[PDB]
A and B are shown apart, each in its own frame.
With several copies, the nearest count.
Chain A
Amino acid sequence: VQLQESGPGLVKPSQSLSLTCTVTGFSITSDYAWNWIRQFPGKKLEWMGYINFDGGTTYNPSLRGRISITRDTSKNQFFLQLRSVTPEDTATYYCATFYGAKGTLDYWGQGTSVTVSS
């Protein structure tokens, strides 16, 4: 219901990327699904994956084995880990909410920019 991203804004190639989304106003283990989306320069939206309220996860096939989504219910967070990074996946990352009964991404974060350079 109130999401906030955080994490490094600069990454070396082919090492890793780790972002954290903190949720306030709701418990991530109760109802919804929690997604990660990215927007490239030259605006183009891409859905990466989500983790469900019961711990199950689903990922975009275009990201074969590079992505993992985890959670920590003790402080209501979920984390995105994108490994073996390349300068093409330099983009703006958002965390979003998915109700399911309605089907749409209702709540979004403020978005954090990630630059892959050297």
Chain B
Amino acid sequence: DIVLTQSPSSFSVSLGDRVTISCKASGYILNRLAWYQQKPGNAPRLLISGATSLETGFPSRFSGTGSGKDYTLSISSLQTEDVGTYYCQQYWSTPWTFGGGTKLEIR
């Protein structure tokens, strides 16, 4: 299948800072990449679709950029409501696969 790998299994930042998360795929995905946000005690919530498009209901601080096998989520000027776990999903091939998840922290 297609395995998605997120290198920074954990991060550490402070408010107002800029953070970047990376997802690397074992195969070409053609922007069929989605980013989900999960808080403790809740189901995942769709944040980005198409690797660039932003879902209605989120600020214009999250951005998505990528091509081929490398994709990235950029959170500029992060706040305290942005801490959580972030997952990358590919919906190109039928056995949809998620990433391992990256947890954000606060210094």
Q: Give the B-binding residues of A (Cβ under 8 A).
A: 43-47, 58, 60-62, 94, 102-106, 108-111
B94–A44 touching, CB < 8 Å: no
Bound Cα distance from A61 to B91, whole angstroms: 16
Bound Cα distance from A110 to B69, whole angstroms: 32
Q: For the complex, is B49 an interface residue (Cβ under 8 Å from A)? A: yes
Q: Give the A-binding residues of B (Cβ under 8 A).
A: 32, 34, 36, 38, 43-46, 49-50, 85, 87, 89, 91, 94-98, 100-101
A-B CB contact pairs (8 Å), 9 listed:
A43-B38, A43-B101, A44-B100, A45-B98, A47-B98, A103-B50, A104-B89, A105-B44, A108-B44
Interface Cβ pair total, 8 Å cutoff: 44
Bound Cα distance from A45 to B43, whole angstroms: 11
Bound Cα distance from A109 to B41, whole angstroms: 12
Name the contact of B49 in the complex, choosing from A62, A102, A109 (C-beta under 8 A): A102
B91–A60 touching, CB < 8 Å: no
Chain B residues in 8 Å Cβ range of A105? 34, 36, 44, 46, 89
B44–A103 touching, CB < 8 Å: no
Chain A residues in 8 Å Cβ range of B45? 108
A110–B43 touching, CB < 8 Å: yes
A103–B101 touching, CB < 8 Å: no
CB closest chain-A residue, reference B91: A103
Knowing A108-B43, A109-B43 touch, does A103 contact B98 (C-beta < 8 A)?
Answer: no
Knowing A102-B49, A103-B49, A110-B43 touch, does A47 contact B100 (C-beta < 8 A)?
Answer: no
Name the contact of B34 in the complex, choosing from A47, A60, A104 (C-beta under 8 A): A104
A104–B43 touching, CB < 8 Å: no
Bound Cα distance from A46 to B36, whole angstroms: 14
Q: How far is the CB of A4 from chain B (nearest CB, A)?
A: 12
Chain B residues in 8 Å Cβ range of A45? 44, 87, 89, 98, 101
Which 5 pairs between the two chains have the least Cβ-Cβ distance? A45-B98, A108-B43, A103-B91, A47-B96, A104-B49
B95–A61 touching, CB < 8 Å: yes
